[PDB]
Amino acid sequence: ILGGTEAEEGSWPWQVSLRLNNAHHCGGSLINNMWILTAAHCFRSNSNPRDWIATSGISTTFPKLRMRVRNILIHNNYKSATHENDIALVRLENSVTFTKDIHSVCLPAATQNIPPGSTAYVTGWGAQEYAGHTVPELRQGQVRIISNDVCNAPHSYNGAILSGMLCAGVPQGGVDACQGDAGGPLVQEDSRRLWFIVGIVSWGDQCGLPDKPGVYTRVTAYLDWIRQQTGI
Amino acid sequence: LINECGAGPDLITLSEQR
């Protein structure tokens, strides 16, 4: 996360770290007591459940809970060349005991309204500037949804943002997800104080460039896939 | 919280209050 702050314990109870060969690699979100929603490209080099561990807690050095992984499911039509359908599910070896500090985020409704300029929070242990290292302490940053068409401007991504994707950032830049934040959530609170995952951190041109906002998997576009795989 | 979803800390503490 660029331009954000350290999250407090319990702020983001669905956030998890995914560790490959005992190092933080990607973020994810609990969507029930067995399942974590994340990005496909996290598993491009290794998709062996035995080599992955999930953790909960604001700290990756001193986690509150370590959880073994049993299954990794990559979207059937994930295409790395165009970043399309960059989405994955991870099923845990044992159910997680839900508490105030550790529990699930809501999936959005198929008709969820997500206006441009609307506020959202992105969370993770990613780098604090382009080319930096990951951090041990969870960070959060506040950003605004940017319309797909504006994001597709010739001076921006110029047609690369597709319908199952979404963009977010701030006009002057400096606030964004970075390398190490992939698979983490982009969340909005509704007026009943429930939080919904609208995006999954996916890709972008560097990090924090004003003309290049963060690109995220649009979760509404994958609801039917998720329900099939998980019953959620 | 429980097998429900989306609850921040303030929502949980509220629901605990009698």
Numbering used by the authors:
A (entry chain A): 187 to 418
B (entry chain B): 169 to 186
Q: What did the original publication write about this model?
A:
We show these proteases spontaneously and efficiently cleave their own zymogen activation motifs, activating their broader protease activity on cellular substrates. The protein domain organization of TMPRSS11D (and all other HAT/DESC subfamily members) consists of a small cytoplasmic domain at the N-terminus, a single-pass transmembrane domain, a Sea urchin, Enteropeptidase and Agrin (SEA) domain, and a C-terminal SP domain.
These banding patterns suggest that the cleaved eTMPRSS11D S368A protein contained its SEA and SP domains, and the dasTMPRSS11D protease successfully activated the eTMPRSS11D S368A protein sample at its LSEQR186 ↓ ILGG zymogen activation motif. The TMPRSS11D SEA domain was not resolved in either TMPRSS11D crystal structure. We superposed the cleaved zymogen motif of the eTMPRSS11D S368A structure (LSEQR186-CO2-; yellow sticks) upon the intact, exposed zymogen motif of the AlphaFold2 TMPRSS11D structure (magenta sticks).
